[PDB]
Amino acid sequence: MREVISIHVGQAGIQIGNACWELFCLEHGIQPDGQMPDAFNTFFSETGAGKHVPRCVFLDLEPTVVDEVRTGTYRHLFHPEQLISGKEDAANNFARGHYTIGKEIVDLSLDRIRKLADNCTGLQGFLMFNAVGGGTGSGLGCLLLERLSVDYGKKSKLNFCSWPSPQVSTAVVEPYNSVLSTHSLLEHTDVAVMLDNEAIYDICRRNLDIERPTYTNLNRLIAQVISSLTASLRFDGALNVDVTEFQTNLVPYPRIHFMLSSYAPIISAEKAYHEQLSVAEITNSAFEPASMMAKCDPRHGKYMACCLMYRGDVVPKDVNAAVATIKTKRTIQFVDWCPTGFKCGINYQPPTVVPGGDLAKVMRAVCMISNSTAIAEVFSRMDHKFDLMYAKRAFVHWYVGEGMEEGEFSEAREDLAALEKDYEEVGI
Amino acid sequence: MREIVHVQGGQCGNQIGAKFWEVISDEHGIDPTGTYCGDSDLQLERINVFYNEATGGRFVPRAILMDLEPGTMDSVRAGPFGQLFRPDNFVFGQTGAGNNWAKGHYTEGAELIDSVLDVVRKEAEGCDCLQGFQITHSLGGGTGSGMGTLLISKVREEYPDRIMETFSVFPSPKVSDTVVEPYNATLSVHQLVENADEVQVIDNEALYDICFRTLKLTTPTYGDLNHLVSAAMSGVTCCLRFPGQLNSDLRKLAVNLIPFPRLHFFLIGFAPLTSRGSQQYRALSVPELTQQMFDAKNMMCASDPRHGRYLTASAMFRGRMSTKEVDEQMLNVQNKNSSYFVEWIPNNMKSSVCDIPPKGLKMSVTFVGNSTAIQEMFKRVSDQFTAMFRRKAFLHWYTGEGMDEMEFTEAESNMNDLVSEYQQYQ
Amino acid sequence: MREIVHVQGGQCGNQIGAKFWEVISDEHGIDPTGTYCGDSDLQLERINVFYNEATGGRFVPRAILMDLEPGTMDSVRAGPFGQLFRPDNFVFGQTGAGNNWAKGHYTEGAELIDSVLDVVRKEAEGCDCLQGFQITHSLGGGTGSGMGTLLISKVREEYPDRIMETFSVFPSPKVSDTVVEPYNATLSVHQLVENADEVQVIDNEALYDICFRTLKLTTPTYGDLNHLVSAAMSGVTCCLRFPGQLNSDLRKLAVNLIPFPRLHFFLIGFAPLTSRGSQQYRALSVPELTQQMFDAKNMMCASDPRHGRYLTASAMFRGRMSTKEVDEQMLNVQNKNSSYFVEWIPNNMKSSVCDIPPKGLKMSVTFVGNSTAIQEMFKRVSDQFTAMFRRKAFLHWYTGEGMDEMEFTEAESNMNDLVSEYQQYQ
């Protein structure tokens, strides 16, 4: 009667997937076989005799990431029929992940999620998980989103996409993939969150005093954000902010639905010994201009509407005190046509930490999702990264060679330019 | 006899009214299992005002839990005194009005308004002659301010001559949640002024001022926060359920507090309120209680009384106390604060005495005041409103559900007219 | 009845009330736990003068202990008998005005003054008609001399017709702490001379001079100096609460000691003050105690009265006495020491015999003498001011925070006309 269907498409979509489900499994107390030794009904079903199957679907046209979890440790945790392994990769092509080999796999995906949707009536939304800088994570995610808009047109879609970073790239045609994707992403996503990779990297530096890890805590840090956002659905709370209100509470216009995110505290055992973690400073560190997961300096950006989920032993009274000091301090500018812009949702359950992980046990934590006009500078350096690649038609030869028509890139550039001028007229 | 039917709506309302039944049941002598202990005829001679006999010897409250989020009354069931309500008075919600006045009033405002009106009639005509309708709700939430307000409309169009009142909380000046506050408040205040006999105003952080300064509390809770609003909620009707030297009625207050039919907003206080450093050395006498109704720090509402003049004030005393320095204590506070009172009404203050003190105490009083201090809150939500219309934001997801631009404009043509008739009377 | 509302300003004021309230509570037979013991009618016959009933049988002092640093009344509360006061009468400052007149009076203390004004009229208006206000403070520090005279200044306007009883501890000549002594002292005294009806001058080393030379105290602390002045407050207000052969009150002192309104600064002696080696050797009678009263060695103002003429004199006799010898024993001190009295007032005297002494003693005296001996103290705080002021001393804080050069010049004009008037009457 109350659930959310999660879709994880793309190579980074699977890796952010199994980090989220390893966190949710130990959070619910359920096991990698499915059974414990009514909060589970928002992310899992019943598999008959007391077992539980996740409400997920994994999608990737290239098989070595799908069979990796089919052979790994969560073999019989997942139902083995939504682990939709394809045949061959899209190879950093939006065009190949949307036109050539997508049509033979979205028939299997929409038929599976049709059965996933009808297991309970009262579905709340979708959890898209993809990387937009690549080919099959962006292309097949866009193809699957378009079918979701025309079939389930009244349901929210919560996109969690890994937007490419200003420096850390590890591809070439990210300006070609991200500019082409974000037009059809704009009118088909109800609510979306940006995640630039190197923003997690620098907060791993200053907050976690680790020099260089691998992708495993790239994904565990994000998975704690997903856990805290949907903990209002899952666990009982003092003031619950569900998805069906969070969609309609932060989004001021039908087109500005791209938001940043931050999480505090992300603190190791090095310095959990040294400072108290109370709301009067966790909110300050969450609003600290180098702590978000997008690397979008909001000092020249301009805040519009913010969402805070306090999880743990949190009273609303020191929440009100801590948000009042945010309002009174000058370094955070809220827009002149929105004086109050704040959410205070309270959950009783403190956040859980993965065993053997780099996080530390904290009493309380705030999850931030905020809409700001700062994000115009994120998409404007995509404009500068793309306009001189397209200036004399680099890499377009095989984008059109599969059967795509020249000139749709330029009207997509009209859509990005329409998005930049929209962000300017919002802040003015 | 005469029975008040209680409607309880919103997440804020279902926690406020739960503490209301937690404080009325244990002062009337009813255990959470429904039985009675207390061996007093004063607690039993009028128990039908709020309760009903179940032919099993227990009392089921005449309360209607109503909400579109299914977790709020889930916590009511799990909480203490959570086995009093009949499950048949419960009406649930699954789609949820998500902090949204528009979808809570029309879209899911239809398939539940037929059932919550079914449950209110067979709690209404099942008695001999009912009296009134108390409604606890919020003007900050979506389903507490939209879905409960459609209930206000449907109750009156069936029952046009009975009294009814709303113990409604309001959006916050200083620290505000549920960011469409003026949208939820002002689209509801039109229906409050044309379709409600009394509306009593509660501010959340004015209650924070109660626990900070007059209570010396470090970290209080919603249990206490709703407890000090349920003390005055008890006090407005305890003189109905109990005898007294000068008894009183909700309609007794209504006739001689509301001057003119469109202004009926009230300023609710409660005395005494003590700390560990305010209980031992403090005299509990009526001249000591005189200053606590007329204390801005002892006020449950954000409106500063010193920035206005009281049109008509009233007090509901309780306890073993002489009725006269009710009234010369109300006479000298009128004479010293003559500039704090309106001049064209002689003897503004109303007095009434109930002969049952609050349980565990010796004396208390519940203050109700029609005052021109209330426009402070009515103008900050007014110009918080006007900042959300000169650039059209946050309401396109109201127009998508039917709430087009027509009704928003006269929601302000009646709101600034409401405060203009307020200021033209001073 | 007649009631005294006590206000303590500064660290000196809170400590001097942390000894006066003890010596007046055991005089009333009150335990630290507020319960009376002593089975006497006379102790409870006037207890409403300095205490208020708490509807529990326990009496709370009508004091307001107040300054800008929390360490002073935390040590009062932790100390014995300091529990008697309300935390409501305690008002807290956290930043603190440090030895600064200007920011005590204008910027910092005015932030706190609107809340301590609330608690002073509650102790004032709570009775039918007050006798007066007793404010004890010192003229050396910042919060007790700057904002201490701010509350002296403002209680003049809402309560003009009632008496203004003040104790002030003036700066010390030879060894003074708190380097800016005359800037605090002279800038306070002008507000202290047109807003206070009578002021008593207590000096610090004159309290020491009584300790070393007449009490023979080997070890006096601040508590030993504090007893000497606590006996002075106890004697001057004894006849209000306790009967006698001849009544006396604060206005009784005021109309007989002030002939001209600009001069109300009083000398205080206290008798008997025995060295305990000779306590068992000293006879106790009126003709031996009167010359202990009229004595420079028993002066808690450090001015030799032999360098001046007594303008007016009075003596609050106390104890089981003979009220003939109440008065020819001061007839003797007038017709022998003829030059030590003014000439154009014949019969300079007032005896005021009060029947009940302090406990154990059969005789006691506080002495109030309006004399031109205080000329030496006002001149000395004047040239210590002007030697500093001629070279712009310690002043850029005072000017930078809400004052200017002009205000200090009339501070010395109404300091200098006090000396010029006392030479007119010399």
Binding site: - | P220, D224, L273, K359 | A78
Partner: peptide, 25 residues
């Protein structure tokens, strides 16, 4: 359901619930 946000710091009467100096003698 972990009613900590309703955990009473008050009692039946309204109020609330229950939670150096070297003196110079």
């Amino acid at each position: 359901l972990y009613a900590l946000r309703d955990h009473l710091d008050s009692k039946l009467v309204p109020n609330q619930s229950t939670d150096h100096t070297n003196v110079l003698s």
